Nucleic acid binder design. Structure first.
Length: 234
RNA sequence: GUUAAAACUCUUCUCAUGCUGGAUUCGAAAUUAGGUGCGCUUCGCGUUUAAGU
């Protein structure tokens, strides 16, 4: 499901070592949508509760550019540049000190990609319902969801077919998970109506690196899915 | 079912002070208290004395 999301209120997603990432990741999208499906008792909730399901792949929200295409990551850096057009990064983070609380927030108004993929007919009605909900009443990503930070309304919704990358020469669009990886990817898995919190920290490989690997792992999928690692045709 | 949830950039501070709607210009110009009506009516300078010796 290809789409364009526009932020009217900005978002704040933190990382470790006092960094905040440029773009909202697909793990945040997933967590928001699974909350939203919980609030509407949609039949897929239990599956968003599971961190393993790979049928629905919520990719990462990547900043679209003036080109209209998707900005692509750059190895050994903290920015993304439309190969089509000469950069997104380290100029949209904005330092915020609010009644004691000091954090960082990525400024609003920029347009990001809403590209999810659905490999079964079991959800087209369900996703439809979630995009319809995201359309009429918005979605929220990041911190301070109940304070209105992270407002994200749709700007475009197209149900357009998708096909895997018929290339073993693939560039990592986002942070893949490998057993001996160097970038520690940290995320979390709450459990509402159970009061359970956990911080999932797993090693893996960073984005913007070309991988010469004949596996091809379906469409992207590096191994976590549910966000995590993506790939693009080089 | 988002390394989440939680937590209001809040509190203090008067657009205030200085400056006069003042200066110039005459309620003036034209018009006669004028027109009508008589100080009139009533009341004899009388009374008294020989041009004589």
């Amino acid at each position: 499901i290809k789409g364009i999301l526009e932020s009217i209120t900005g978002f704040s997603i933190p990382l470790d070592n006092g960094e905040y990432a440029l773009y909202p990741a697909g793990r945040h999208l997933r967590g928001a949508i699974g909350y939203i499906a919980f609030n509407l008792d949609l039949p897929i909730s239990s599956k968003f509760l599971d961190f393993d399901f790979d049928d629905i792949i919520f990719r990462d929200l990547l900043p679209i550019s003036k080109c209209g295409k998707i900005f692509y990551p750059e190895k050994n850096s903290n920015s993304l540049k439309c190969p089509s057009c000469n950069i997104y990064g380290s100029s949209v983070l904005r330092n915020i000190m609010a009644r004691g609380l000091s954090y960082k927030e990525v400024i609003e108004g920029k347009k990001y990609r809403l590209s999810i993929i659905v490999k079964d007919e079991k959800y087209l009605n369900e996703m439809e319902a979630i995009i319809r909900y995201i359309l009429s009443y918005g979605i929220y990503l990041g911190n301070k969801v109940s304070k209105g930070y992270g407002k994200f309304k749709i700007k475009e919704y197209s149900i357009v077919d998708i096909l895997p990358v018929k290339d073993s020469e693939v560039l990592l669009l986002s942070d893949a998970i490998i057993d001996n990886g160097e970038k520690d990817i940290v995320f979390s898995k709450k459990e509402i109506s159970s009061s359970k919190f956990e911080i999932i920290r797993k090693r893996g490989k960073a984005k913007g690196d070309i991988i010469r690997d004949n596996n091809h792992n379906g469409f992207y999928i590096g191994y976590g899915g549910l966000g995590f690692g993506e790939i693009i045709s080089l």
